[PDB]
Design a protein around this nucleic acid. Structure first.
Lengths: 69, 262, 69, 67, 67, 68, 67, 262, 67, 66, 66, 64, 262, 65, 68
RNA sequence: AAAAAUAACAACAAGAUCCAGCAGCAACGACACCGAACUAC
């Protein structure tokens, strides 16, 4: 109901190992591949895996073109 | 004493340069971060142990087509964060950019297209430069400092090449190319490294494939160590050791005073 | 959950492919057509598959006037 | 929503030029075209959707009387 | 829930206490609480503004008023 | 939930520990917690503050309050 | 349990790895985690504090951890 | 090239302007935006298609008392958003302000009361000026530049008035008004449009009803295209045509290099 | 004073949320209430007073142009 | 010192419990008993003489104005 | 001030991005817009006012003559 | 002037132990045998000449 | 009317200009004072009545070598006093300054070294600029309005030179020269006469010897009429006629409404 | 009021002694003294940097003077 | 203007007492006062050190000295 | 305790209550302070 689009997109970005770029409400632009996700959290990779919270994210732009069926 | 050495050598095929001794030559020489350009292979090819250098972490952002280009970094300590892609189409598609942020500085690795292959390559180079000038105008406002290991494939001034008159028609020396390269070092403020500590001529990095050109030393300076003015004071020395010669481009070595610390 | 205006408004903006312009809460502007929408995210096709989170969106200024069904 | 809905409905029916201040601090002057639990469409040259979770306050430029 | 917010606002509304509400962005709104409902408060000083609760940080009445 | 948010708050309430509330905008409120709700936390400074919970960044008691 | 946040936080607390939580405001809070539940992640550095989760942007451990 | 022509005019009643033929002349003159100060008609009156031109939009703010004032504004493209307000009691009551936003540029149809009727009018004008000084001190922070196409009804320097020795006591030229204008155009930095494109005299925009002054060229400059210092460089030409007189004043066409867009 | 007062009085008239960085590395936020030759005042809830010998820098939140 | 003197005098007369934060970081608490060129006598049960050249700020705690 | 004034003026007119090291260790970057006997103006996206009595050193990013 | 000099004179005439806390954070003990406008002598175990600028606060050991 | 015309024409050798007809053209071209510079001849040579015009006085100051430099000056009426000194080794030793005084107005024939001859010339130019900025800062105390007829060999802004993208490296347009010229027209308060009345590009006053640049109009503006802010308001018009050129530079003719007098 | 500072600094500058200026914050600067003023001094370890007097603590000459 | 610093320093110099200067930073230097002034003090060591007045916090003589 | 110097004043009744908004800072100087002396940011 509430994840009909948010979950498949993140799953496709994770499986294909796409180097996405996340934008926080603070304006910072975090970089790194997505390792996992949930209803309120996303685990980045890059040099050191760090946690990010959904309520703090604004836009998740994929560096390379992503294809989600 | 406190010093930070950085190597920038366009190998144009890590396989060939390694078969000639690039890997061993670098491992034997002291260095902190090797920012080589033009991998000509995929990130997996770099991940192989034959490419890795003991004691240096390895990262790479391959291109859409292996032979079309590619960039790879060799860090001695786990950087703060690695960023692949520059935002442009030609940048993200052909993997011509890869940055590794540190506590303050953030060495990058830029690889402009050659342009000598054809008019289409020249147009791609012009477009990428018209985008990169805007990228730099936007980047010069942030606080942290950068050290681009860019292979601009464009000479800056006449002193950077011998017999500049005949090169007026060959790519890499056209009027708009010189204009862009001088504007990047002009109003934007991004100073240079090689021509900042030793302003003497007869120093070049690139040489044509013809061995006769090397004997006569009719080369161009394509490998640049662009660095924000904040670091211009820390530049200590630079060198263009052309003796080994691992590819069509000569290795550009530099040493600054800023001490990286993860 | 039964949105009388959000759902149909976004659906009409998507079907007609209007150059929507999303102003985020951070204060930055994003331009590009609306590819898809969800209860918590919006995919705008500005030559990429960018996903902007709902809670980070402040306004959705359309480029041309749309007919609200 | 015992008072939000009547207030917004009165502001819409009266067509008073309201000014919405957002959490970011920007001002938006316009008229309430249609509102819901999460949106308050403006009416200034075009229809501009404004999210509820981003509005700081609604200032009616003209005094209004509650229903 | 909200077992302490409603009785604390009812006292301010009945006593006509001048409250200086603080928005999240730091801007202040001085005035008395004319009415309050779930996710909305009415502040009438220079104009009957409708301040959203999700945008309020503190409600200082500048007077010891407690039920 | 709130298995932890209640102990660490009711303790500071009953013990009357001077707490410092850092909000999300940067300002710092000071004082003792008089009575807290699921949505609001009333302070006991010189004037009843009433600081909302959705706009509080951190709550750092100057005294090492025990965690019962 | 039935999520990724809870196991990660449990591992962080059990291993006592120094984490550097970054708030939405942009400021950080150096210190390790002591106990979490919902809307709270108690930090124990020099003075015990209480983050509210909803005001947290990222949780960056100072050493790689595997859930 | 990017020629943005703004045509500001004081119709002194849309009825007289329509009777004399202002609509046809204005439509003939190519311009991006036209400001009409002192409409003296309600918004519903302007709704008539007679005033609606082809290729232009109809915007207007009507005073509380229709005959007391009112302003209009037409543009070639749908502006971003119209702001029919100012904040002060006088402006909100007499609808003497209407703004149209564009890309990094916003045009305002300012209208200060003439103050030529009586003492109460002069007091209202003094209050409006003492409030607009604060308004301009506030707008001095935002990034977007503004273009106030306003009939200030106040002459600035001697170049704006002939026989200044005689008009030293007529409303619109006294000491406090001169000081306020000099401060708004000097201290705040809002450079004028005419004094930067053509620093010549005899450029009058107002003429008393007496035909003697018209024949003698005795006129005052009241219209003003007040420009933020950011737009001063974007001025090219500005000439006041008096032969197409459609009201007590005359148009003030000004062309800029800046180009507006939704 | 040729350049000090024209800046502080400008900040005061404009009410810019300025951040004052002291000499010991501590940061304060607020607007200048009434600056003097030795001490400056802040417009926070407490109206703190900071001496002009322990202030290292004064950075405004919005760019201020000298008149 | 146009506003410093009257401000300190108002803080003294009303016996406001000010908080003087020095430059080194340590904070002192106590009402202002008196003040003079490069000296402030803070008296609250115990008397202390804090030099102004070492004081960084003075939080009045209570909303007090001149 | 035989060296302070000419040095600051030369650094200003040329718009040299200077690095000002304060006393507490932290360093600021930017060009000198204007300077006074007790205040310097740093332009680096925010025209900030640094105090002379708090600055420790001022290093130009590039050499400057006199 | 009206406070520093009389206060130091009272501290000296009473021979009260005076704790001079410096801006660096050190607590110097002793009595003020004499005082100047720039330096204060704190003698009790060994002679000392603490400069005025380096003195953060000066607290007596007993009421004065 | 009270018109005052001044002509500044660099000749790069008075012999060539006299051969091309500069003497007759000046005698015909009505003016008050001709700021001709770069005489390249000694005083005994200028004394020759062949150069002396009718109705115009003659003053000249040469260096130790006639060809090393020197500057001359004509005038309608006998100036109050003439002075051939500045106080700098780079000015007196080269005879690059000569000032004539009328009623509270001093006209100076300033001549900066080109610098294109070599690196030593560029160093001398930089020294002369660093000393002249100090001289100006010292002269701000006087109340007399100054009219420096300068051949600065430096372009101020982009409009002052065509194809600046290529000229950013050639002498006469580098960063320090631009900064100095902006400081002269900036902080010091001085303002150029030509740029005051005509704020348009393509108005150049120098072209290389190659006729290609002349055909393409690729030139610089190496001639300025620096005016004290007191005289900034008296600038009526300025012109740079290129067709009647007698050397690399073009005559710069500035007319004011000021009326000089003995 | 500089009968002891000015001569010492002038001697150190003329003789070109590589001095080390220990500041108050504990940092150890180096380089030769180029030109000193009543409130500022100039060093040239790598570039012409201006050190403020009020921030200087001691000046250790590398060679006895 | 002062009348207690000059004689104290002159005594510490002429008596050649091993002086210990502790600065505001929190360090220690040892040596004899070779010369003093209104803003500088020369200290004898392996290399003469010029210590500024504003940076000196305390000057302790290794042995007690009497005022003149 | 002293303008390395006013090509020169038809003249001194007189000096000791909220940015119609940036394709966005790998992160804000790490948040408003959390009381016997030890010499690189």
């Amino acid at each position: 109901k509430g994840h009909s689009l948010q979950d498949p997109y993140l799953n496709t970005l994770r499986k294909e190992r796409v180097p996405v770029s996340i934008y926080l409400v603070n304006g910072i632009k975090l970089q790194g591949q997505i390792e996992s996700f949930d209803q309120f959290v996303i685990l980045l990779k890059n040099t050191v895996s760090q946690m990010v919270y959904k309520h703090a994210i604004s836009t998740v732009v994929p560096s390379r073109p992503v294809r989600l069926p | 004493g406190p010093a930070m050495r950085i190597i920038s050598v366009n190998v144009n095929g890590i396989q060939a340069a390694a078969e000639r001794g690039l890997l061993s030559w670098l491992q034997a020489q002291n260095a902190d971060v090797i920012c080589l350009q033009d991998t000509r292979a995929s990130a997996f090819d770099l991940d192989d142990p034959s490419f890795q250098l003991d004691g240096y972490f390895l990262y790479a952002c391959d291109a859409e087509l292996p032979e079309q280009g590619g960039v790879a970094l060799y860090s001695r300590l786990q950087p703060k964060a690695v960023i692949s892609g520059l935002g442009f189409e030609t940048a993200d598609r052909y993997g011509r950019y890869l940055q590794a942020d540190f506590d303050k500085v953030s060495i990058a690795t830029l690889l402009l297209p050659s342009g000598q292959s054809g008019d289409e390559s020249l147009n791609q180079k012009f477009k990428f430069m018209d985008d990169f000038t805007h990228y730099l105008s936007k980047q010069r406002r942030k606080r942290r400092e950068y050290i681009y290991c860019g292979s601009l494939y464009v000479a800056h001034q006449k002193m950077d090449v011998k017999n500049w008159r005949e090169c007026q028609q060959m790519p890499g020396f056209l009027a708009p190319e010189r204009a862009w390269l001088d504007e990047v070092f002009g109003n934007l403020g991004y100073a240079d490294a090689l021509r900042e500590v030793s302003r003497e001529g007869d120093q070049f990095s690139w040489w044509p494939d013809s061995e006769q050109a090397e004997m006569l030393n009719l080369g161009w300076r394509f490998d640049y160590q662009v660095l924000t003015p904040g670091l211009r004071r820390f530049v200590r020395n630079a060198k263009l050791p052309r003796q080994p010669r691992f590819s069509q481009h000569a290795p550009l070595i530099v040493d600054y005073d800023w001490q990286l610390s993860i």
